[PDB]
Design a protein around this nucleic acid. Structure first.
Ligand code: NAG
Ligand code: NAG
Length: 725
DNA sequence: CCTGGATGGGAA
């Protein structure tokens, strides 16, 4: 009956991740397994016979078994990996090895990143003529230090005639390795000390599609972590360095202390799709340069964090393939009609990153003049007015104005933004009585995020100027009218959040709508509200058609049948997560006929005794995890015909009995029983139940632990065989 | 290259 691969899990992948193993597991027949993952175990020594039973392995991951500081040194016998003559992928990263082990020629992908291998010679990689991918980053840098530098000897990799990918980051390299295999398409040599580049360093690299030479001359101003400042003032780039790269699609020159651009650099890069110029000193350069003149196939340009009014250069009008532009951390306080003028006629520019720029003045109307803008991020600036649920992803004209300095919303600020479909105003300081006058131009707005503000919500004309509004986020919002009276007057509103709100005395005793389908009302005081007797007894009843209701964290200690009966009869989902429900009659679920999903986790249902799941509930999933459930009455789940998922994890069950379920147990798609102090006597009967539904219980192989006996406590229900008595 | 703003992943 047992799973064949104790103490690991069978997914042709055998998963043995995070099992504290100090040796390679031996386990039926192991002849059919092809993938083995042993990530973050404790294997510090490998041996000639350790993989002999796994001769058919294609993929082997040994990452994080013997990590150097922060020490650990891994020893590897000469023949360990040779047993696997068809090994294709191997990850040896985060292991304390000093030389590369002998490897079979079948190998295609190899990772030696974050090890202690300080020299690569022709003998290091002997016979790897089918190698396509080689990564070795992080062998000589501040988090994995070394004296001197990694050494890659001239022509060492020439035997790798099929090599397409090579990464040698964080290795204190002073020069590009010489005579690299001409087959290269990807070369990452960033974050070394290569302070000078010429065409010679890239000699015969004519199949390159991406080159990353960034971080080799680093300004270390306001560096959070240890950083080697460049001896030079700038990366020294020979003007002809890149010309022969005719298939170059990606180039990254980030953090190179570049003070000017030279159009020579890109002159022959006729398929440059992605250019990264971030973290340099190109503030003035992007304002005046001509370098962009012919960058005609460029789709992505990153100018972020490049340290009189900012105005992009005229050459930017040539970037007619440009889809995405990053201008974060440039720090310009003004956004006018000349700032981004040369972008406006670009036929495919859909994404504009403009955050962390301390913008305190913005004519946002400019974004209505663009050809295909779909997302402009203006978050984390200092905008305070007009000048003088967000997903929304990819498909909607979206603007992010979060974390700005808006205290008051004036409708003139939105002139010519009338195509906006999604908008965020969250984490501002808007203290305003919203009255239906604030968002007039926003005729097409569907999604509005106003969370983390100080809105006054008494006025029933609130948001009535937003006739397409479908989703309104008012979460974490802090004597006339009534709170939330506006909800009934928004005919399109399908999704609403009033979570973690300041719910005052004059709050409307009713929420009404014909359209709201999801209401998040978590983190409020529904416990205190429903304690007020009849006053809030029908609070949610007016939400006709409501499908989803979140009442998490509302300090609920009881749920009377009247309160359930007076929720909208359309409910399919109800969450009472993280309340204080101590007792609850399950037959009262009859008052929610269409209920499919019920979440009662984080409460204190000490047991599942009081009543049963009633005929003929349509309940599909029941989450009752993190309750101190010590007992379940037989046939409890028996009547829930449609039951498919049940989570009993983190309860105080000593067993899990078949009698709780009946025939339903075999249509269950999940049955989670983890983190129960199971009592693992030699007689224990739950073991035979769990094995029957093994395919449908998560983490059975080793995640289902014993709470007793004392020697078996904290250990798997297979740490000893329990079926021996 | 992706990711963030620092770094680690990655895998024809
Ligand atoms: C762009 O290419 C043309 C020739 O095709 C050349 O005359 C012009 O100088 C180039 N622009 C720059 C700045 O490289
Ligand atoms: C079951 O509940 C626990 C509670 O923390 C959660 O961690 C786990 O992801 C849930 N499992 C399933 C199958 O959803």
């Amino acid at each position: 009956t047992l799973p064949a691969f104790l103490p690991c899990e069978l997914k042709g992948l055998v998963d043995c991740n995070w099992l504290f193993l100090k040796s390679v597991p031996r386990f039926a027949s192991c002849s059919n397994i092809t993938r083995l993952s042993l990530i973050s175990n404790r294997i510090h020594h490998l041996h000639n016979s350790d993989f002999v039973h796994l001769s058919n392995l294609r993929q082997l991951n040994l990452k994080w078994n013997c990590p150097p500081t922060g020490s650990c040194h891994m020893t590897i016998e000469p023949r360990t990996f040779l047993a696997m003559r068809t090994l294709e992928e191997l990850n040896l990263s985060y292991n304390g090895i000093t030389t590369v082990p002998r490897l079979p020629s079948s190998l295609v992908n190899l990772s030696l990143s974050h090890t202690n291998i300080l020299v690569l010679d022709a003998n290091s990689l002997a016979g790897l003529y089918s190698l396509r991918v080689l990564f070795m980053d992080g062998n000589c840098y501040y988090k994995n230090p070394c004296t001197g530098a990694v050494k890659v000897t001239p022509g060492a990799l020439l035997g790798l005639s099929q090599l397409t990918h090579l990464s040698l980051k964080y290795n204190n390299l002073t020069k590009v390795p010489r005579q690299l295999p001409p087959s290269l398409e990807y070369l990452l040599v960033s974050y070394n000390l290569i302070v000078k580049l010429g065409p010679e360093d890239l000699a015969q690299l004519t199949s390159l599609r991406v080159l990353d030479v960034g971080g080799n001359c680093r300004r270390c101003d306001h560096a959070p972590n240890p950083c080697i400042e460049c001896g030079q003032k700038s990366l020294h780039l020979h003007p002809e360095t890149f010309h022969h790269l005719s298939h170059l699609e990606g180039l990254v020159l980030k953090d190179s202390s570049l003070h000017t651009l030279n159009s020579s650099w890109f002159q022959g890069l006729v398929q440059l799709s992605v250019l990264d110029l971030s973290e340099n000193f190109l503030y003035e350069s992007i304002t005046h340069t001509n370098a962009f003149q012919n960058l005609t196939r460029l789709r992505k340009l990153n100018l972020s964090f490049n340290y009189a009014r900012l105005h992009l250069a005229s050459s930017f009008k040539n970037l007619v393939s440009l889809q995405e532009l990053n201008m974060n951390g440039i720090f310009f306080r003004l956004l006018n009609k000349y700032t981004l003028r040369w972008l406006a006629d670009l036929p495919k520019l859909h994404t504009l990153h403009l955050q962390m720029n301390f913008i305190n003045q913005a004519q946002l109307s400019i974004f209505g003049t663009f050809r295909a803008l779909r997302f402009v991020d203006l978050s984390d600036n200092r905008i305070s007015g007009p000048s003088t649920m967000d997903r929304c992803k990819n498909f909607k004209f979206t603007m992010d104005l979060s974390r700005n300095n808006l205290v008051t919303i004036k409708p003139e600020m939105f002139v010519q933004l009338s195509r906006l479909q999604c908008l965020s105003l969250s984490h501002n300081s808007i203290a305003q009585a919203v009255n239906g006058s604030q968002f007039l131009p926003l005729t097409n707005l569907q999604v509005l995020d106003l969370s983390h503000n100080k809105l006054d919500l008494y006025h029933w004309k609130s948001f009535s100027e937003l006739p397409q509004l479908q989703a309104l986020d008012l979460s974490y919002n802090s004597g006339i009218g009534h709170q939330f009276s506006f909800v009934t007057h928004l005919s399109m509103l399908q999704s609403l959040s009033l979570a973690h709100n300041d719910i005052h005395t004059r709050v409307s005793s009713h929420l009404n709508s014909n359209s709201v389908r999801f209401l998040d009302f978590s983190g409020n005081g529904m416990g205190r509200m429903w304690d007020e007797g009849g006053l809030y007894l029908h609070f949610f009843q007016g939400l006709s058609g409501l499908l989803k209701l979140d009442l998490s964290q509302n300090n609920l200690h009881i749920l009377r049948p009247q309160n359930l009966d007076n929720l909208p009869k359309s409910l399919k989902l109800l969450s009472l997560r993280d309340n204080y429900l101590s007792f609850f009659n399950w037959t009262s679920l009859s008052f929610l006929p269409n209920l499919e999903v019920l979440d009662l986790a984080g409460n204190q249902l000490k047991a599942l005794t009081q009543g049963t799941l009633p005929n003929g509930t349509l309940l599909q999933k029941l989450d009752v995890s993190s309750n101190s459930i010590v007992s379940v009455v037989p046939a409890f789940f028996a009547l829930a015909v449609e039951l498919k998922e049940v989570n009993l994890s983190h309860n105080i069950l000593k067993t899990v009995d078949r009698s709780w379920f009946g025939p339903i147990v075999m249509q269950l798609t999940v049955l989670d029983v983890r983190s129960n102090p199971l009592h693992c006597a030699c007689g224990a009967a739950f073991v035979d139940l769990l094995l029957e539904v093994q395919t449908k219980v998560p983490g059975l192989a080793n995640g289902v632990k014993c709470g007793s006996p004392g020697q078996l406590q904290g250990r798997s229900i297979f740490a000893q065989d329990l079926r021996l008595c």
